[PDB]
Structure 1
Amino acid sequence: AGITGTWYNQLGSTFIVTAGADGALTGTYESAVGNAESRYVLTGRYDSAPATDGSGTALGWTVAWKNNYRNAHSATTWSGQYVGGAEARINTQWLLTSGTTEANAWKSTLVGHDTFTKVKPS
C-alpha cells in the first residue's frame, strides 16, 4: 500500500523501492527513456512519521545514470510526496543534471514531473 513496492511512471519507467524503518529509500530504477539500459541503483529518504492530517508523505531519491552497462554522465533527483489513495501514487518533480563543460553549464539541467502508480500505463 505504502511506499515499498514496484511503481511505474507515466513513461513506463520502473521504480523498485524499499522504505526502511530508518527513513531510507533503497532500490533500483529502470528507465523507459534516455541513454539507459537495465537497472540503476537508487537511494533516497522519506518522512517515516508523516503528518496525520491528510497530508502526503514527503520523499526524494537520486539515480546516477551509470551502471555496469552504460554511463550517461548525468543524475536525476525526484522530489515529491506519496499520496495514500484509492490508487496510491507518488507525485514528483525532478531535476536531471548532466555533467557539462562550464560553458555549457547553463544548459545542464532538465526539469519535469513524474507520477508513479503501482500499475504500468495502458
Structure 2
Amino acid sequence: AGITGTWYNQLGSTFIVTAGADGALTGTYESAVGNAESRYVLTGRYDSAPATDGSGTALGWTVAWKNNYRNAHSATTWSGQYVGGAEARINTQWLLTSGTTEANAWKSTLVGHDTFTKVKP
C-alpha cells in the first residue's frame, strides 16, 4: 500500500520494500556508502493497524551486510515511522553494529538517522 514501493534516503541508497497483510516487510536494500555492494536482503515488521488520526505508522527492518559478493560482518536496523500523504516519508534512526572482539566491543555500534522519499510512480 503506502509503504510498498521504492524509496531513497538522503545518501542515495535504494530501498525496495513490500508490506504484507500480516505486518511483514520484505525486500532489498542497496547502500550508497560503506563496505557494501549490490543488493542485500531486508526483513521487517510494521503496525498493520495504525491510529486513524494524524499519527505515522511504526515500523522497522534489518539488513545484515552480507550477500554473495561481500560481507562487512555487520547489521543495521532502522526504526521509525511511515508518514503518508502526497509526499510519503519514512523517518528513521538506525543502529549499525559490527562484529568485534570482546576488547573492541565498546566501539561496535554507530548511530544515525535516514529520511526516505518515495518514488515508484
Is the Cα–Cα contact under 8 Å of residues 12 and 120 in structure 1 kept in the other structure?
no
Cα RMSD after superposing both structures:
1.9
Deviation of the 1:86 alpha carbon: 2.8
Q: Deviation string for 1:22-64 (max 9, x for gaps)?
A: 1000000000000000000000000000000110000000000
TM-score normalised to structure 2 length: 0.96
CA distance in 1, matches of 2:69, 2:120: 25
TM-score normalised to structure 1 length: 0.96
Is the Cα–Cα contact under 8 Å of residues 9 and 120 in structure 1 kept in the other structure?
no
Structure 2 regions of 5+ residues with no counterpart? none
Structure 1 regions of 5+ residues with no counterpart? none
Aligned length: 121
Is the Cα–Cα contact under 8 Å of residues 17 and 25 in structure 2 kept in the other structure?
yes
Secondary structure of the corresponding residue to residue 104 of structure 1: helix
User: Which portions of structure 1, spanning 4 or more consecutive aligned residues, are displaced by more than 4 angstroms?
Assistant: none
| Fraction of identical pairs, as percent | 100
Secondary structure of the corresponding residue to residue 61 of structure 2: strand
CA distance in 1, matches of 2:32, 2:50: 31
CA distance in 1, matches of 2:60, 2:83: 14
Secondary structure of the corresponding residue to residue 117 of structure 1: strand
CA distance in 2, matches of 1:8, 1:102: 35
Deviation of the 1:93 alpha carbon: 0.2
User: Mean alpha-carbon deviation: is it higher for 84-93 or for 31-40?
Assistant: 84-93
